[PDB]
């Protein structure tokens, strides 16, 4: 219900270190948002989507981050891939909405924008809504690394190459996930 500078924010987080905003109870209207041509996608799960809000809910969480265009499809219940496995995981029973839009004009630079990162290697998948910003060296072989990076001992985060002349599938997209909490104590 102050969805203003969630979407407006000049500044968005890497997906591995995704941001979170807590939004409790006030006046929240989905009549313009849902139909805006300014978003490339906006899809709701567990909600009556094109029947919009007659929901009520106790808290709403807004998670925001940047990924590559062809990875937006991983921000959905039951998906797999580096992003859904190692970076941002939605639960199967997810209840909420996924909003994304092309941010090539903000987030890609002529030399490449190496500020946005994602986790490439992880010992196991994340549980739903977990956020892992650890940077232990990834042991890819059977020999321990002891914090060196040589061969089979990899820094776990990789940078996107965001480069403005690439096709739209390789371009950066800003994502906002709205989770509708509810629980049993309103």
């Amino acid at each position, epitope marked *: 219900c102050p969805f203003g500078e969630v979407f407006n924010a000049t500044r968005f987080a890497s997906v591995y270190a995704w941001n979170r905003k807590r939004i409790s109870n006030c006046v929240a209207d989905y009549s313009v948002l849902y139909n805006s041509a300014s978003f490339s996608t906006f899809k709701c799960y567990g909600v009556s989507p094109t029947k919009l809000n007659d929901l009520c809910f106790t808290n709403v969480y807004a998670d925001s981050f940047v990924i590559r265009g062809d990875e937006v499809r991983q921000i959905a219940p039951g998906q797999t891939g580096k992003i859904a496995d190692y970076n941002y995981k939605l639960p199967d029973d997810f209840t909420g909405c996924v909003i994304a839009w092309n941010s090539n004009n903000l987030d890609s630079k002529v030399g490449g924008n190496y500020n946005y990162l994602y986790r490439l290697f992880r010992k196991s998948n994340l549980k739903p809504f977990e956020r892992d910003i650890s940077t232990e060296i990834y042991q890819a072989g059977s020999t321990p690394c002891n914090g060196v990076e040589g061969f089979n001992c990899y820094f776990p985060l990789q940078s996107y190459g965001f480069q403005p002349t690439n096709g739209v*599938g390789y371009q950066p997209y800003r994502v906002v996930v709205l989770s509708f909490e509810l629980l049993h104590a309103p």
Partner: antibody
Framework: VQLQQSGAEVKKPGSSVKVSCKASGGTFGNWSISWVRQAPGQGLEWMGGIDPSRGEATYAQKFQGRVTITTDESTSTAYMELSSLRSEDTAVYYC???????????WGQGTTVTVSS | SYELTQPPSVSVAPGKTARITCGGNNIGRKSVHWYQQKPGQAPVLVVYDDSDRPSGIPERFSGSNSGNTATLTISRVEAGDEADYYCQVYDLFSDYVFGTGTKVEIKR
């Protein structure tokens, strides 16, 4: 900037074909490459594409598992390999440059592949 | 989006205005492209980013995109415009999608 494709191919069912696309702009630059096909009397069908400087290719859902797209850095040449060919892979195959706004810009001249016994 | 629907053909008298529609859910959120194709030739991009013309494409080709329909408009149609026309978008879940194609014929 311009795109030269290899010549026509005739293939038997079950075999594979490897088609090439050589950019005349000298080098691949910073732009993406898609492969598109069109069967006789039918429409255009995206098969996949690659960022030549990123080295990882992506593929349409169908075709996943029997198409491989690669690029030759030094020669400024893209490749599309389709295997386990079947009659209905008879088509003209195009490479094309992807645009910044979501389309395709420069098209190769097309490569006819006929699959038959 | 995912599927793009085009009429199989439009038939237009010479000098009149041809309108080729392209339907898709919320196509207005996508960047529509239009290609002209003649027999034995590669597609030629004629309108990009909903309404922009590449250099060398005649003034008479125009595009629009709003809501659930995109449209290619060809003013003062002449025989040189006889061809198949494809609309096309990038969808985040289906990748590059082409319409089924519309054949423009000159009415007579």
């Amino acid at each position: 900037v311009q795109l030269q494709q290899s010549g026509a191919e005739v293939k038997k069912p079950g075999s594979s074909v490897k088609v090439s696309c050589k950019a005349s702009g000298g080098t691949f630059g910073n732009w993406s490459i898609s492969w598109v096909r069109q069967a006789p009397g039918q429409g255009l069908e995206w098969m996949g594409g690659i960022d030549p400087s990123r080295g990882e290719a992506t593929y349409a859902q169908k075709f996943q598992g029997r198409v491989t797209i690669t690029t030759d850095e030094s020669t400024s040449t893209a490749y599309m390999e389709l295997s386990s060919l079947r009659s209905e892979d008879t088509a003209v195959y195009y490479c094309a440059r992807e645009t910044e706004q979501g389309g395709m810009d420069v098209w190769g001249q097309g490569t006819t592949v006929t699959v038959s016994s | 989006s995912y599927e793009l629907t085009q009429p199989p053909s439009v038939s237009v008298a010479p000098g009149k205005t041809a309108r080729i529609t392209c339907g898709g859910n919320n196509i207005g959120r996508k960047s529509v492209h239009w290609y002209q194709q003649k027999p034995g030739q590669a597609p030629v991009l004629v309108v990009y980013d909903d309404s922009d013309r590449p250099s060398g494409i005649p003034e008479r080709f125009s595009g629009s995109n709003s809501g659930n329909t995109a449209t290619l408009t060809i003013s003062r149609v002449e025989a040189g415009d006889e061809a198949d026309y494809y609309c096309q978008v990038y969808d985040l879940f289906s990748d590059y999608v082409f319409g089924t194609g519309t054949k423009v014929e000159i009415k007579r």
